[PDB]
Amino acid sequence: YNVGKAEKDGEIRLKNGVAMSKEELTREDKNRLRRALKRKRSKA
Amino acid sequence: YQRFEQAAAFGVIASNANCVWIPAPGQLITSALEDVNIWDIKTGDLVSKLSDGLPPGASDARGAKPAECTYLEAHKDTDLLAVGYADGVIKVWDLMSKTVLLNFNGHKAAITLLQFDGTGTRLISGSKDSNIIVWDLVGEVGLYKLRSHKDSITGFWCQGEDWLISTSKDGMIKLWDLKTHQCIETHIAHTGECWGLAVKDDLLITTGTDSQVKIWKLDIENDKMGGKLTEMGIFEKQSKQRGLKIEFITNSSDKTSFFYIQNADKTIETFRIRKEEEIARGLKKREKRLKEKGLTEEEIAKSIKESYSSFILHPFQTIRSLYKIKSASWTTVSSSKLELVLTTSSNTIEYYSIPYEKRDPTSPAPLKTHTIELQGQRTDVRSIDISDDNKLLATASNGSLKIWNIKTHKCIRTFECGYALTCKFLPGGLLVILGTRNGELQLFDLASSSLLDTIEDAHDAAIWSLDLTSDGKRLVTGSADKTVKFWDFKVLKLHHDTTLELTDDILCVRVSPDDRYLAISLLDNTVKVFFLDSMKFYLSLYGHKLPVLSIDISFDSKMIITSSADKNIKIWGLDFGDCHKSLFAHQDSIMNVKFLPQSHNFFSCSKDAVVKYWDGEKFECIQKLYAHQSEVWALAVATDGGFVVSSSHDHSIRIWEETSLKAGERLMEALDLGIAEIEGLEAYNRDMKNAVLIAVNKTPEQYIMDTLLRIRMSQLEDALMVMPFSYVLKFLKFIDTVMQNKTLLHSHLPLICKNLFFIIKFNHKELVSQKNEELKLQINRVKTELRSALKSTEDDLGFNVQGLKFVKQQWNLRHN
Amino acid sequence: GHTNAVQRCSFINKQKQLISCGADGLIKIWDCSSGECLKTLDGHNNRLWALSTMNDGDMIVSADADGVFQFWKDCTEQEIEEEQEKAKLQVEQEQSLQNYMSKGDWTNAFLLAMTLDHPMRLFNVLKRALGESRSVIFNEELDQAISILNDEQLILLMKRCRDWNTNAKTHTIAQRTIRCILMHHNIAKLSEIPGMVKIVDAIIPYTQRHFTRVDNLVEQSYILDYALVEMDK
């Protein structure tokens, strides 16, 4: 078994093993996560 | 070149902000775009005007439009005024000294609400960025930020230091604990936005988007984890539009309470809080009526709950104004009458008095006692002009023509007219002629202060343009009926002379200063030049993507400028009609372009609120003038060229006048600070029987622990080798103190194991040689708690792997 | 948008909408202003010749050629209220959850985090609840809270415990929660829960890895014992 994508559409699950529901995240946490994803897709 | 600077600004009575009333009907403080006006209601004259400084057009002046005032709050006792701007800046103003005392910058958007505390030492601000910040006036710092709301802060209530209730555009009502800086309660006030909030003792009223208005009781000391705010009942106001502001006022003599719900429409609805004895009297009566009707007691109880709101509240009276209302405020409460002051979106101040006796008012409608209207115009100015003497400025707007003194800035005369589109003085400065949208031509006399003549059938459509020859005897009028008509002035009345019928609608007509050319702009993106003497077609100018909106001809009749809705200024030569240059001047449609007299330099104004100064020979922009908040509709240049007057959509007439450590070393420093404190406390405690740590607010063990965590693991092993042996004994003492804190031990148990074993391994030889008995006890101790913590984790791991294995066995047995 | 001939068409909601029936048996509610199919009602298996509306379409009756009536009742107002009440409840739970964590009421905050499905908050509740116990598994109250969990909550909780276990920095919280579940539930019942076994498939290999580690750390800890005997000499 290996940690993959979040099964629910409202949650972010990282390969680190930490799950993050979008509801609980602050606006500041969501912004940096979005920018982090933007960096990941850019190099991809 | 010379610089143009804003000499004066006038024509605004109340901008898009609230109004603050101060007792002496007393004075009123209203916003005028970037400046604040103080009016005297009785006289209707401007008392003082607050301007920070830095007039637009100066070199030191900023390069963007100034921030407009959005909210005004004045602490009556301390004689301070707080002003919030559209950029999120709060400026505390000394009303007596008329100067800025403090400047706060903590909001990223426009300020929606300001509120002094009762004592006047702390200021609370809410902004469109959804943050509430509490400022310390004495300390000139932001104490803390309240960041739960997800939209603009519409309203909030804080009458005590302990608690704060806040409303936002996301539809939530939130109770704050000012001592913990946290939100305790959250309820959905309305299905959409929530716009109003007023609190009186336990009673609390909020308004949503629709006509529904909710009632809540505020039991602050409930302390159940819920129910500090409980909804009681819903009452529907007459106005279906959103309710913006709610305000309570109490009559000291009779203890009666009144409030209004300022609507987005032209209505203010006032209400009355029934006294308890009235509620008890009514409750008994309505019970009798329902009981007589044969209803059951349970039904009667439910009905009372359904009609609960009606018991406390009584619709008192509704104020109707001719214009949409921007803000309102209670002025005076008395047994005889109740008074309100409001500002409209159409640039005026209105004062209303409500005489009443007992439950109901005496008069069917409120009494409009005072109004401030003379120094402004209700609708935006569509055209302006300057008299040949450069003393009178005529500003034509929809429904009124007003005339000003450029020196005193005071309107001299007002004339009622139609939807005026173009105005121009006749020579001598004693007459004005208007072109209305209805096709009417109106002529006015200043000395008579009345209209001389009206031509109802001057044109079949809007008279978009109108111009005069240099002699002043001939008038050229262009209209949307696709005709140019020439008129003569004979002793004064206007006589039709000729008609020139063109192929499309006419937007601008200009006559050359030498009276030789006549330039006409058409809706087909072309400008046609005629010979005025013979009316023979001469040239046609092509090159504009969109229709030409303004035309002007140089003083020597060589160049002609055309500005269009395609954002381009094109300079042409009248000799052959060739385009000398096309300038991408503005970011929106360019409405007016004028030559400076006796020079080829010209001005340009556009819908993007910018007035630009250009060089007609070098084709370069000399100066950008950022003063208007919205579209600039009209522009005018003095005959001398000394000043330029511009009027905008914001009701303002502005006059421009010509003037490091590495890993291991950080650990060594951390050990010195932490263990110096630990040893100091140990020595202090034995006898009884720092700045860095206090700033970070961490116990010495945690301060060292955090330093260990930050060290990257690839650097960690090499960082520990650099440490001397003297710091190793310090390290062992730190591990010993950590062992007492079981919470800290297990949180970072693997890390302490890796570090502790590496230290012992690297310098085992020196450790054993030391004959310190105290060190022996530490290692004996550090061993025991280290084993127990490790074994506890291993015991859980060993237990689970066997249990989970057993679960597999039973599922396999039952399913195979 | 109709797959077959349209047999009936009537206006509902005054000018706003239009409802139509077709031989395909499908009743489509359209928006007159935008001309888009807002909803499709499929309760018939044959052509619809008759369609009657009452109270501006608040009640609609359609008769199949087979002889089946469908008495449609408008329920937009009813559905929005259910959403509003659901939304109102969710806002209360969020605020109550935050208050419990700040107060440190981990036993109550645990229940809310499970219902709201907030993993980070659930991890913090369990992590810091464990920290206090350091100073049976978690607490007498919180163990009871875990015990009363139903099958759906257990599967969700074990999924989190599975993911936390993979990371060596967070496995400790996972092991104790699993230990609490095994110690406060019928093991027979846990097996029957569908999908529980596949979740338990993933936990065991990582648990063995964590067990091989830590055990080595116990071996390394005996360097201290060798230090003490040398000092005794």
UniProtKB/Swiss-Prot annotation, chain A:
Subcellular location, record wording: Nucleus, Nucleolus
Superkingdom of the organism of origin: Eukaryota
Coiled coil: none
Signal peptide: none
Function recorded in the entry: Involved in nucleolar processing of pre-18S ribosomal RNA. Required for the early cleavages at sites A0, A1 and A2 during 18S ribosomal pre-RNA processing.
Similarity comment: family membership: Belongs to the MPP10 family.
Name of the protein described by the UniProt record: U3 small nucleolar RNA-associated protein MPP10
Organism: Saccharomyces cerevisiae (strain ATCC 204508 / S288c)
Gene encoding the protein: MPP10
UniProtKB/Swiss-Prot annotation, chain B:
UniProt keywords, alphabetically: Nucleus, Repeat, Ribonucleoprotein, Ribosome biogenesis, rRNA processing, WD repeat
Chief place of localization: nucleus
Family matches, as PROSITE patterns: WD_REPEATS_1 (PS00678), WD_REPEATS_2 (PS50082), WD_REPEATS_REGION (PS50294)
Residue intervals passing through the bilayer: none
GO biological process: endonucleolytic cleavage in 5'-ETS of tricistronic rRNA transcript (SSU-rRNA, 5.8S rRNA, LSU-rRNA); endonucleolytic cleavage in ITS1 to separate SSU-rRNA from 5.8S rRNA and LSU-rRNA from tricistronic rRNA transcript (SSU-rRNA, 5.8S rRNA, LSU-rRNA); endonucleolytic cleavage to generate mature 5'-end of SSU-rRNA from (SSU-rRNA, 5.8S rRNA, LSU-rRNA); maturation of SSU-rRNA; maturation of SSU-rRNA from tricistronic rRNA transcript (SSU-rRNA, 5.8S rRNA, LSU-rRNA)
Localisation per UniProt entry: Nucleus, Nucleolus
Top-level taxon of the source organism: Eukaryota
GO molecular function: snoRNA binding; U3 snoRNA binding
Entry keyword Repeat: yes
CDD domains xrefs: WD40 (cd00200)
GO cellular component, one term: nucleoplasm
WD repeats: 64-94, 106-136, 148-177, 189-217, 376-405, 415-445, 458-488, 543-573, 585-615, 627-657
Miscellaneous section: Present with 9620 molecules/cell in log phase SD medium.
Similarity comment: Belongs to the WD repeat WDR3/UTP12 family.
Subunit structure: Interacts with snoRNA U3. Interacts with MPP10. Component of the ribosomal small subunit (SSU) processome composed of at least 40 protein subunits and snoRNA U3.
Free-text function comment from the UniProt entry: Involved in nucleolar processing of pre-18S ribosomal RNA.
PANTHER family recorded: WD REPEAT CONTAINING PROTEIN 3 WDR3 (PTHR19853), WD REPEAT-CONTAINING PROTEIN 3 (PTHR19853:SF0)
Protein name: U3 small nucleolar RNA-associated protein 12
Source species of the chain: Saccharomyces cerevisiae (strain ATCC 204508 / S288c) (Baker's yeast)
From Swiss-Prot, chain C:
GO MF, one example: U3 snoRNA binding
Repeat region (WD), residues: 1-42, 44-82, 92-133
GO CC annotation terms, alphabetical: 90S preribosome; nucleolus; nucleoplasm; Pwp2p-containing subcomplex of 90S preribosome; small-subunit processome
Keyword Nucleus: yes
GO BP terms, alphabetized: endonucleolytic cleavage in 5'-ETS of tricistronic rRNA transcript (SSU-rRNA, 5.8S rRNA, LSU-rRNA); endonucleolytic cleavage in ITS1 to separate SSU-rRNA from 5.8S rRNA and LSU-rRNA from tricistronic rRNA transcript (SSU-rRNA, 5.8S rRNA, LSU-rRNA); endonucleolytic cleavage to generate mature 5'-end of SSU-rRNA from (SSU-rRNA, 5.8S rRNA, LSU-rRNA); maturation of SSU-rRNA; maturation of SSU-rRNA from tricistronic rRNA transcript (SSU-rRNA, 5.8S rRNA, LSU-rRNA)
Chief place of localization: nucleus
Subcellular location: Nucleus, Nucleolus
Annotated keywords: Nucleus, Repeat, Ribonucleoprotein, Ribosome biogenesis, rRNA processing, WD repeat
Superkingdom: Eukaryota
Subunit text: Interacts with snoRNA U3. Interacts with MPP10. Component of the ribosomal small subunit (SSU) processome composed of at least 40 protein subunits and snoRNA U3.
Known role: Involved in nucleolar processing of pre-18S ribosomal RNA.
Note from the entry: Present with 8070 molecules/cell in log phase SD medium.
Protein name: U3 small nucleolar RNA-associated protein 13
Lineage, broadest ranks: Eukaryota, Fungi, Dikarya, Ascomycota, Saccharomycotina
